[PDB]
Design a binder for this molecule. Structure first.
Ligand SMILES: Fc1cccc(Cl)c1-c1nc(Br)c(-c2ccc(C#Cc3ccc(C(F)(F)F)cc3)nc2)[nH]1
Ligand SMILES: Fc1cccc(Cl)c1-c1nc(Br)c(-c2ccc(C#Cc3ccc(C(F)(F)F)cc3)nc2)[nH]1
Ligand SMILES: Fc1cccc(Cl)c1-c1nc(Br)c(-c2ccc(C#Cc3ccc(C(F)(F)F)cc3)nc2)[nH]1
Ligand SMILES: CCCCCCCCO[C@@H]1O[C@H](CO)[C@@H](O)[C@H](O)[C@H]1O
Ligand SMILES: CCCCCCCCO[C@@H]1O[C@H](CO)[C@@H](O)[C@H](O)[C@H]1O
Ligand SMILES: CCCCCCCCO[C@@H]1O[C@H](CO)[C@@H](O)[C@H](O)[C@H]1O
Ligand SMILES: CCCCCCCCO[C@@H]1O[C@H](CO)[C@@H](O)[C@H](O)[C@H]1O
Ligand SMILES: CCCCCCCCO[C@@H]1O[C@H](CO)[C@@H](O)[C@H](O)[C@H]1O
Ligand SMILES: CCCCCCCCO[C@@H]1O[C@H](CO)[C@@H](O)[C@H](O)[C@H]1O
Ligand SMILES: N[C@@H](CCC(=O)N[C@@H](CS)C(=O)NCC(=O)O)C(=O)O
Ligand SMILES: N[C@@H](CCC(=O)N[C@@H](CS)C(=O)NCC(=O)O)C(=O)O
Ligand SMILES: N[C@@H](CCC(=O)N[C@@H](CS)C(=O)NCC(=O)O)C(=O)O
Lengths: 146, 146, 146
């Protein structure tokens, strides 16, 4: 973990976000059980009958939050890892990772909590900023080593 | 690949799981063709007419299996890679990777094979256990190097 | 970035593809706004009323393109990174990465541009070829170091 000064901070933030995604998955299952809304007939028959194989708006919302996480957190896992080895200023790197972590946690809260628009959208944009920044820096480093 | 004793086992299991995901993608395409159920009008017109731009329960099932793979296998690719470099006991590491591999292969079999509930759900939980374990260990390593 | 001769080319192609995914996300948002088709009631109420919480075929198409990217580009991020450290011929490695990059950019153009079938499908197959190749090579390297 000491292979570069920014790496521990990256690994802390990334792993917290992976755990946060696992939390969303758990919540999704709990909502399916509570609302009796299952995607598979075999699940529905286990949990009350075939009429419970149905969509539910809260379940769909959970799925959207989880999908948005996959669209954003997964690229961060790649970009942040690579960026950690490019010798960025440690404090600047810390700020990139912290902005992403705070933005993404806020995003899930805003999504699952049904907060008014554009609160969720703002948190999405906020978290994308450090990702865009890291992507550009990686582009320059890669291009210049060709 | 010899940069840490656990790494070869990790790379074997991870790559098999990526290949397994590719298999799911291939199956999905085959089901679309067999059931004549396409997501795009251009595809439908190529394969029999506009009435074949339609949903199908078997196609939707394939998509759910593939999505669940992305929700679980992708985090494993990150966590298992990092975990491999934290000097875990080689046999303990092997068991983490093997439980994930077996659990995930079983999950796809249970999903696509339409096995009774909660067989699929149990395999999901089983495979998440080593991921949770690795995530916590990474958290501790990262936090302590801050 | 100089830890292996193929790594800079990999990092260039991967980061361009991550940026390309961000472009798809931006396009998706623009289409939602233009077509007034939102997934969340809170979004719809901010942007004209509850009747705009609705599906739209162009939005759904954008989501499919983005999902297919996650199904293919994310595994490439893993496979290409590992493959870069296995000492492949630099030119051969370059060709693997370039075929994937060109295939995937073409895929998004074919998908969002609604090009006739099977143009999109061909680009998908084309880009999967270097991924399959890298996966097999990693399997052999991992297996032989067990
Ligand atoms: F585009 C959409 C498609 C579908 C559904 C919705 Cl709800 C929308 C949507 N409506 C609005 Br109004 C926004 C919006 C509004 C504002 C910002 C920012 C921002 C931002 C500005 C500055 C910073 C900072 F602090 F870094 F400088 C951060 C975020 N993002 C997004 N998005
Ligand atoms: F929650 C849901 C939401 C939607 C649809 C469904 Cl079908 C469900 C659902 N119904 C049941 Br009953 C389960 C369930 C039941 C059991 C276990 C375990 C487990 C487990 C226990 C011990 C181990 C071991 F071996 F490591 F100790 C492994 C797995 N997981 C899940 N899930
Ligand atoms: F299977 C489907 C399911 C759902 C919807 C659709 Cl639209 C389809 C589908 N219909 C056709 Br016809 C194809 C198709 C046709 C051709 C190739 C290739 C290829 C290929 C061959 C050689 C190379 C090369 F250059 F490397 F040698 C590359 C790609 N892929 C796919 N796919
Ligand atoms: C990491 C996971 C974060 C979970 C945050 C969940 C926030 C839920 O918050 C709740 O949401 C409800 C709407 O769903 C509202 O009715 C409640 O007022 C609100 O407290
Ligand atoms: C909303 C889209 C705006 C793009 C986000 C701004 C990203 C800024 O990113 C910056 O780019 C500079 C030039 O490449 C680099 O020198 C900096 O290191 C980098 O932080
Ligand atoms: C890695 C990919 C694993 C593919 C496992 C496919 C298991 C399919 O198995 C089949 O499923 C059918 C229901 O779909 C059942 O009707 C059949 O009895 C069963 O044999
Ligand atoms: C279903 C949710 C239960 C969580 C899964 C159990 C994970 C146990 O994981 C364990 O955690 C310990 C304390 O952090 C560590 O010392 C061990 O190395 C680790 O294996
Ligand atoms: C990286 C992102 C690539 C974006 C490529 C967008 C291609 C859009 O291309 C447009 O598509 C329309 C159908 O949607 C057609 O009607 C137009 O003829 C075509 O120019
Ligand atoms: C459409 C499915 C066809 C599979 C794609 C072909 C992948 C070829 O991949 C090749 O495999 C050889 C044997 O493992 C290796 O020696 C080569 O290094 C590798 O490039
Ligand atoms: N797949 C996204 C692409 C754009 C995006 O990520 N938008 C942000 C800001 S509005 C978001 O929070 N989307 C909600 C979601 O993905 O469900 C979508 O459909 O909205
Ligand atoms: N996205 C998941 C979140 C929870 C989850 O992954 N559940 C496991 C155990 S029930 C599963 O196999 N889900 C089936 C699926 O994702 O389609 C869901 O909708 O179920
Ligand atoms: N999830 C895919 C699995 C197979 C696949 O990726 N097919 C390619 C070639 S036809 C594709 O472009 N799919 C379009 C899509 O994923 O929406 C699907 O439903 O089609």
């Amino acid at each position: 973990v000491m292979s570069s000064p920014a790496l521990p901070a990256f690994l802390l933030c990334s792993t917290l976000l992976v755990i946060k995604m696992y939390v969303v998955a758990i919540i999704t299952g709990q909502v399916r059980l509570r609302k009796k809304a299952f995607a598979n007939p075999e699940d529905a028959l286990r949990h009350g009958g075939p009429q419970y194989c149905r969509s539910d708006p809260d379940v769909e919302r959970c799925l959207r939050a989880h999908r948005n996480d996959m669209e954003t957190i997964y690229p961060f896992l790649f970009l942040g890892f690579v960026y950690s080895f490019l010798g960025p200023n440690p404090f600047v790197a810390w700020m990139h990772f912290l902005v992403f972590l705070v933005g993404r946690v806020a995003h899930t809260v805003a999504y699952l909590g049904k907060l008014r628009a554009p609160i969720r959208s703002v948190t999405y944009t906020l978290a994308q900023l450090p990702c865009a920044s890291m992507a550009l820096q990686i582009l320059w480093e890669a291009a210049r080593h060709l």
